[PDB]
């Protein structure tokens, strides 16, 4: 996360922290017990034995309770970088209580309202080309993109529906590597997307994309 600041204990019960091949990686949602929401490029094609997920901690190494994969459902249009959701069983259920909650998500066919105050949270890198990664968690707030203006910066054919932007015009708040599957809520903390993709961090008129839960939710409701 790029000009953020450290999250509270409680911020995002439903995060959670993914590692790959015991390193960090993404970010994700617990959507109930054995349920997690992703971006479909954490995850695509990858040896699924590599992946761990950690609920109920700020820490992306210690704390809380962990889990191994069962399954793994990428969105089955997941192409370049649309449609970038899966969905994750895992293996150890999570029960709720303590600093761990399930994540509420956007109605179908919602897309967030240019303007409206979004936070994103994660452990990915703190500037683009950044080496060390945070073990404490990170949020930041920032302003929805008008898909106009998304597309005014990368092609009317890159951003489509179901994606989203958000960032500021001047850059300096944004998601980065390692943020990716991670949550992106609302004023309200509903769950209106996941990390997905964007030119380099933080970078002027280069806004955050998301992928949008309210335009995917039937994937999600077919899963969860």
Request: charged fraction near 10%; proline fraction near 4%.
């Amino acid at each position: 996360i790029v000009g953020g600041t450290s999250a509270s204990a409680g911020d995002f019960p439903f995060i959670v922290s993914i590692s790959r091949n015991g390193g960090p990686w993404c970010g994700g949602s617990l959507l109930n017990a054995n349920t997690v929401l992703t971006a479909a490029h954490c995850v695509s094609g990858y040896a699924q034995s590599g992946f761990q997920i950690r609920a109920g901690s700020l820490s992306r190494t210690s704390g809380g309770i962990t889990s191994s994969l069962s399954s793994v459902r990428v969105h089955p249009s997941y192409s370049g970088n649309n449609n970038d959701l899966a969905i994750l069983k895992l293996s150890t259920s999570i029960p709720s209580g303590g600093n761990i909650g399930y994540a509420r998500l956007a109605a179908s066919g919602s897309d967030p309202v240019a303007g409206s105050s979004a936070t994103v949270a994660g452990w990915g890198a703190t500037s683009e080309g950044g080496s060390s990664t945070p073990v404490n968690l990170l949020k930041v707030t920032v302003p929805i993109v008008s898909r106009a203006t998304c597309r005014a910066q990368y092609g009317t054919s890159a951003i489509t529906n179901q994606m989203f932007c958000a960032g500021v015009s001047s850059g300096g708040k944004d998601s980065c590597q390692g943020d990716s599957g991670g949550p992106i809520v609302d004023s309200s903390n509903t769950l209106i997307g996941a990390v997905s993709w964007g030119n380099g961090c933080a970078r002027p008129n280069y806004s955050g994309v998301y992928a949008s839960v309210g335009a995917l939710r039937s994937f999600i409701d077919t899963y969860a």
